[PDB]
Design an enzyme around this catalytic site. Structure first.
Site, PDB file in Angstrom:
ATOM      1  CG  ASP A  33      37.890   9.384  67.364  1.00  0.00           C
ATOM      2  OD1 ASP A  33      36.776   9.538  67.992  1.00  0.00           O
ATOM      3  OD2 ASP A  33      38.836   8.689  67.896  1.00  0.00           O
ATOM      4  CE  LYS A 146      40.437   6.717  70.003  1.00  0.00           C
ATOM      5  NZ  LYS A 146      39.063   6.278  69.721  1.00  0.00           N
ATOM      6  CD  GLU A 187      39.299   5.003  74.386  1.00  0.00           C
ATOM      7  OE1 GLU A 187      38.034   4.782  74.495  1.00  0.00           O
ATOM      8  OE2 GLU A 187      39.757   5.663  73.378  1.00  0.00           O
ATOM      9  CD  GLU A 189      35.186   1.613  76.029  1.00  0.00           C
ATOM     10  OE1 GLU A 189      33.904   1.551  76.188  1.00  0.00           O
ATOM     11  OE2 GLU A 189      35.675   2.194  74.988  1.00  0.00           O
ATOM     12  CE  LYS A 229      37.725   8.687  75.036  1.00  0.00           C
ATOM     13  NZ  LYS A 229      37.527   9.311  73.721  1.00  0.00           N
ATOM     14  CB  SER A 300      37.830  12.338  76.074  1.00  0.00           C
ATOM     15  OG  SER A 300      38.260  12.022  74.752  1.00  0.00           O
ATOM     16  CE1 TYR A 363      32.884   6.475  74.638  1.00  0.00           C
ATOM     17  CE2 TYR A 363      31.273   7.434  73.098  1.00  0.00           C
ATOM     18  CZ  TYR A 363      32.346   7.590  73.985  1.00  0.00           C
ATOM     19  OH  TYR A 363      32.862   8.827  74.212  1.00  0.00           O
TER      20      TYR A 363
END
Lengths: 363, 363, 363, 363
Positions: A33, A146, A187, A189, A229, A300, A363
């Site tokens: 995505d 998401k 999520e 993070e 997530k 994921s 990431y």
């Protein structure tokens, strides 16, 4: 307090089923995505132009990999654009995803925005008309969404304000999706940046997750109809102290066991800059951890499932096969990892790796 | 906690000055910010068509009233559209407003949305890209914004969730505007609907305002650079018990004294369905109340400043003068009211009224 | 939320009256409530033994100062023991205090206890059977109580947990006293220790006070029937940067204006280690500050009213007069200070001092 | 936030071990901790005088039951007094308990106190000098404590204030005990009183438990070193609608799965007025429930383990044997129940009962 049900037994059943299929044993999620801005830096790495056709071809490359990939991928997170594209065979991508036994997801947040009077902290926006957008996406075949919030560890980084504010917006986003038959992937993070060790990350992760589930509760969302997530508990990318994979695995499942209620159908980890291989080894060790893990512990991943494929492809239509092969490799490995059956490294201890992809983020 | 300033002394000075001018002694605010949907039901009452020109003509009617209105109106809240319209003399409306010594404001919320698992409760949206919109509006001459949240009293209506959620979104909206040199008017409106008495409204108003200032604090907004637009404390529209204007005035200033810090530059009340006359009498009594009131207590009325003018106008361009006269009347009365000098009724007691305009809402 | 009144109009009136008399213009509070442990270190400074008689004689010394002290002292905070002692003339001390137009107060907390998993942070205990104790003290002539919580500024000191926990216990203590006709003095003290500057103290003081009034609200206490005993905003005792008295005065009233609702009858500052003279000069400047101060700004000093008297006394019964004279001096100065009429230093600027008494704490 | 460990790995290990032994498979807890006031109403039911000797004899009766009871009882909750008594054989009761493979617990709260401006709501006190008391009890052989908070369901009963306040005091109590090597049993009891149905109780139980674990988190307690003693989810004692045991079992484990983290070693239910038999059948069904239950689901009963024994005894020393037999019966049944092996009624459905003991409270 007082009872005014948010969801009907019917809507509740529906959300549980979707959540459960995505995270069925051996399955994970492909997060494909990337917005046009981030895929651009990808395509650009292999000196390919960022054109709609190039983006459409590469997404296709991933989405039309052979059937060895079917039992491994429970869901795929798509960017808005790709959700309306077609494969060469004239089939809308949601169709090729479903036909291969996958559930299609859609990223619905509109990026992070600064938090004023904070040390470069952020919330994320995208709530405006989110209900409308969700009803449409539902019509157009998506079954889960998401939304990504970002926290960071600094001398005074995970500021309560950031924790409270981010937790609350995740809850608002979750509430809206559930009302439209879409299973929200929550999520929160915590970024790998900084030179903090394993324990600081575990502490912070525990404090963040606690806030998140309290918020979720306040906002009355139906847990069984959600996915989490989080980030794995790891040292900061700049920490000079070394840790084994069961050190991070132990740290991760502990943090998780103290905060997320057993009613949460499953937690699908993000790779955050870890190499494809390292990401697999950590997922495996996590699943090999001796402690009772009442929820699915799976993947994921985005670039951790895509690095080798993208690099194999290198823009040449001629390398389609070789590229798809690289991705199927990874999918298989991660299907094994999320079962603690990952055969190379990874095992109630380990400490291997080797690949690499992170940037001021993670990431 | 820790200090990372949100605003610089420079930005802080700026916000205080604007806030102070709007609410200078004898001044109030004209809220002329009806969206095309609500003005439509207005224009329609006087069998006039809801066309851009008709809306533009009526806004002009109000905005070009003679100079007797200048010392009375500190600011004017405009709808997005009107902010880009011109008077017959070719002058952009922000220009005619300013030339008359007024500050122009802009409504920036995008309406209320339902709160799931609640008894018809609501938040309000409009945060998405709010920063961008605010920077533009600033460029285009607006100096303050308006965002309205709505709470209601029922057997279990002001649910904490609603209180918490609404308070938090008011804080987010306030934070963003201040970052762009726009003075936020914070509007937590508790609806007059229901048959609750004076005391239930006072209790609820006190609980709501407490939550709001705590939120504002958490989010670190600069109070001096804000305005508060609460409801007066009144019985419900369906309550059969009668109350005098000092009963409501006393109830109102008490509620206010217990909750809003003296650093808040001023509170500009909404009329919520009260007749033009009744709204004036209550504002006056409020200002006649014996207790220490450390902030400006003024008006920020919409239909309470417009009923008679609209009705006088009745769509006929020929009645321009007679209409503007009706509005100037009201402006004068309210300039007097907000000084406790309102000569008719209104005075540390009273109990008069007579006009009327409310609907399932309040206002 | 919902209305179940905590206090009746009758109980409410009572609490307001007491609160108002204590803090009448020109008046302050003598805090003579040292426990036997702390007075011991006092008596010991003047090589006098810590015996009940010595403690009783010294308390008497202070409490039987001539009538010049009457218009200056609105209330006196006593330790449990002294509340049951008598003056040489056979009069119980609450009697001599009242006869001199003072209200008697009683310290009711049972000291601070460590907060686990914190950096040497603390709450305070004393809630157990507090209701019973309060009913008795009321019977025995006390009309207000004192409970002191302690916060500190460090790299990570005012931890939310400490802020939240301390604010909540102040609210519990306040609720219980009000139920027994005792006006609670709420004392959230942020310690002067550390080398932090003026602004860090102001920020922290603002965050703490915000939490405290929110807690007070949640717990439904009646503000008008309370007193606030904060610290003035000053640099840390170890800060090398210098500040004038209006710098600290400005910083102090700003912090106060942003956080404590105008309904709070008055704020009686603690001296926290400042010399008698310095404490007077700062109180004065505070009262000379140009900003609107909707509540009484006065004193509630302990050693800042006692240093010179104790030292003059030096245990010799022969020096009674000379000692009482030293205390009356101070009382007069502070009656002047709390009116911005303090004639020596102190004035919308200043920067004098000279005396000194602080220890790992502050005071 | 920031890391300052509350407990060392050593102290952490210790707390986990104790928590785990108490709740080992097949084991439960005897709550024999009635204060002299409540046991008085017991002894009085069998026309026996409430004398120290009578209380000591009856406690002995229970505590010296034959060895069939050993694998069934993991711990025993004692009242302060009994903790210092001896059996006829000259052995201190903590000694006879331990020798029989049981862990001894001590009730440490000092009852409930009213919450002002609430509808007969309550917190509980006992924190004052709790640390000292805990260190002594530890020395004197106790390894876990009990603190009971009480919530009730009414038109507006579980007021947030009550929920927040009670949750916070449970956290404070838990923190102090853990610091002294005592495993806290956290008891947020929602009373069976009122005519509310199954679902209202489930909703309220879910909201309460959510608040409790958030509080516990904020206060940084170590979950693994704690026990939870909730109420089962049941209709109100005055509800006219009937429900089966799996209806209540399903409702109970759902509520639990949504709120308490898997890291919590075990939950030991209170019987709250249910007959001995009914209490056994519900525990069994709970353990027969199809859903994943990551923690021990056992008993911590008082009168549900004692009714028949007390009645058999009837004050006569001659009936010692017959009485002890009645208790051993129950202990066995509950050891079976907490394994879903309870042979009579109880099974993934059921709906039997018959015995009875409740009063304006529940239990």
């Amino acid at each position: 307090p007082y009872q005014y049900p948010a969801l009907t037994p019917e809507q509740k059943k529906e959300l549980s089923d979707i959540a459960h299929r995505i995270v069925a044993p051996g399955k994970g999620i492909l997060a494909a995505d990337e917005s046009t801005g981030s895929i651009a830096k990808r395509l650009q790495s292999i000196g390919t132009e960022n054109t709609e056709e190039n983006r459409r071809f590469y997404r296709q490359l991933l989405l039309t990999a052979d059937d060895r990939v079917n039992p491994c991928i429970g869901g795929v997170i798509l960017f808005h654009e790709t959700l309306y594209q077609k494969a060469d065979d004239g089939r809308p991508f949601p169709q090729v995803i479903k036909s291969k036994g996958g559930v299609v997801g859609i990223k619905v947040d509109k990026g992070v925005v600064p938090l004023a009077g904070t040390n470069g902290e952020t919330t994320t926006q995208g709530l405006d008309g989110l209900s409308e957008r969700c009803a449409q996406y539902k019509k157009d075949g998506a079954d889960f969404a998401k939304w990504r919030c970002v926290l960071k560890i600094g001398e005074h980084t995970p500021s309560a304000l950031a924790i409270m504010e981010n937790a609350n917006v995740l809850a608002r986003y979750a509430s809206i999706c559930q009302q439209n038959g879409i299973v929200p992937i929550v999520e929160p993070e915590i970024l790998p940046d900084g030179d903090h060790d394993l324990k600081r990350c575990q502490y912070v992760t525990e404090k963040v997750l606690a806030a998140v589930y309290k918020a979720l509760s306040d906002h009355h969302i139906y847990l069984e109809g959600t996915l989490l997530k989080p980030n794995m508990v790891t040292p900061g990318h700049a920490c000079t102290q070394k840790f084994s994979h069961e050190e991070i695995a132990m740290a991760t499942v502990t943090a998780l066991r103290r905060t997320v209620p057993p009613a949460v159908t499953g937690i699908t980890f993000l790779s955050g800059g870890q190499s494809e291989e390292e990401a697999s080894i950590n997922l495996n060790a996590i699943n090999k951890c001796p402690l009772l893990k009442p929820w699915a512990l799976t993947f994921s991943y985005g670039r951790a499932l895509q690095a080798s494929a993208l690099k194999a492809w290198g823009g040449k239509k001629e390398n389609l096969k070789a590229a798809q092969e690289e991705y199927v490799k990874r999918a298989l490995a991660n299907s094994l990892a999320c079962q603690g059956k990952y055969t190379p490294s990874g095992q109630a201890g380990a400490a291997a790796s080797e690949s690499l992809f992170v940037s001021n983020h993670a990431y």
